[PDB]
Specification:
binds N-cyclohexyl-9H-purin-6-amine, Transferase(Phosphotransferase), domain 1, 13% strand, 5-stranded antiparallel beta sheet, 10 strands, phosphotyrosine residue binding, alpha+beta, Phosphorylase Kinase, domain 1, ATP-binding, 3-stranded antiparallel beta sheet, 337 residues, apoptosis, nucleotide-binding
Length: 337
């Protein structure tokens, strides 16, 4: 009953209004008759793809487990009373006003706003990393804003514990290690993404907007300069590594030439986030303690996870039928009664 597609969430949730498409599929706002407020509802239909089931379970378990101001929560989950009838899962979340993507398309951000948004992203990410989780897909459209400039990190479908080749909407925020298909990357890939986001807040345009695969790397090299053999220390394809090492030498472009109006402390931190070498890259607590964020940094007011997150049984090996059973179990607490 919206865009010709089924959206069965009533009677508690009424007055459906189309917002847009996932990621997972249709997203609507709806009136919550119990809580007298409008909410957001994501419809997910994953049970025919093994990887969609992984994404959905991951999403649900992680968001249900996390509790943090800067991370979206899950209010409610709708699905059929029997597992046989369960074809769709509806995830209810607080309605946010916008995301960083749309904001950056229309608005210029004061230095104070850039600084505070950055703080909130890193504050939330500090919690994430403290649960031994990598988000793996940080980008402006996954950063939601409310009316009072409160920022929440969203979409943990691609998140894994810190111990692909699939389609994603954009790769402009992936670390070089990810682009080069390395097998053994760390929390530092998330820091890279945040740096890309920082650059975009400073200029209102993506810093590394590649048109295609190899072009993405050329954009990176064209600004950071040629990487050293030491910078390329990840387990990566030999031929890819050789190709990269043989490209025309690029000199590092100074930050103040790309961002001639940016706070000089912001550019210093930016420099630390966008380092080619992952081991050289700044960590989340170090980034938080950078002079740029000094007016917000407060380790007594930056919660970490009660315990490192652990999928007690691994997910990528389960047949999609078993994943559906786990999804059924994880959502049963939201059923009446
Ligand atoms: C996706 N979109 C939303 N709202 C839109 C509204 C239009 C501007 C962009 C954000 C959401 N609110 C809570 N979770 C959401 N997931």
């Amino acid at each position: 009953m919206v865009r010709g597609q089924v959206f069965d969430v009533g009677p508690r949730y009424t007055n459906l209004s189309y917002i847009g498409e996932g990621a997972y599929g249709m997203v609507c706002s709806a009136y919550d008759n119990v809580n007298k407020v409008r909410v957001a509802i994501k419809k997910i239909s994953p049970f025919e793809h093994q990887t969609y089931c992984q994404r959905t379970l991951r999403e649900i378990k992680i968001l249900l487990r996390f509790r943090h101001e800067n991370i979206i929560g899950i209010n409610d989950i709708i699905r059929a009373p029997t597992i046989e009838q369960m074809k769709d899962v509806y995830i209810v979340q607080d309605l946010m006003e916008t995301d960083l993507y749309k904001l950056l398309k229309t608005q210029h951000l004061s230095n104070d706003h850039i600084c505070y948004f950055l703080y909130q992203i890193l504050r939330g990410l500090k919690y994430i990393h403290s649960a031994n989780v990598l988000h793996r897909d940080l980008k402006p459209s996954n950063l939601l804003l409310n009316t009072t400039c409160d920022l929440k990190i969203c979409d943990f479908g691609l998140a894994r514990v810190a111990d692909l080749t699939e389609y994603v909407a954009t790769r402009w925020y992936r670390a070089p290690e990810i682009m080069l298909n390395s097998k053994g990357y760390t929390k530092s890939i998330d820091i890279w993404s945040v740096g890309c986001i920082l650059a975009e807040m400073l200029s209102n345009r993506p810093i590394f907007p590649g048109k295609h695969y190899l072009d993405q790397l050329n954009h990176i090299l064209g600004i950071l300069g040629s990487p050293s053999q030491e910078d390329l220390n990840c387990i990566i394809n030999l031929k890819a590594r050789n190709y990269l090492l043989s490209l025309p030498h690029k000199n590092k472009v100074p930050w103040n030439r790309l961002f001639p109006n940016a706070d000089s402390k912001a550019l210093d931190l930016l420099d630390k986030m966008l380092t080619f070498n992952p081991h050289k890259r700044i960590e989340v607590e170090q980034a938080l303690a950078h002079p740029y964020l000094e007016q917000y940094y407060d380790p007594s007011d930056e919660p970490i996870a009660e315990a490192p997150f652990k999928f007690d049984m691994e997910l990528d090996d389960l047949p999609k039928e078993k994943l559906k059973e786990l999804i059924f179990e994880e959502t049963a607490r939201f059923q009446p009664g």
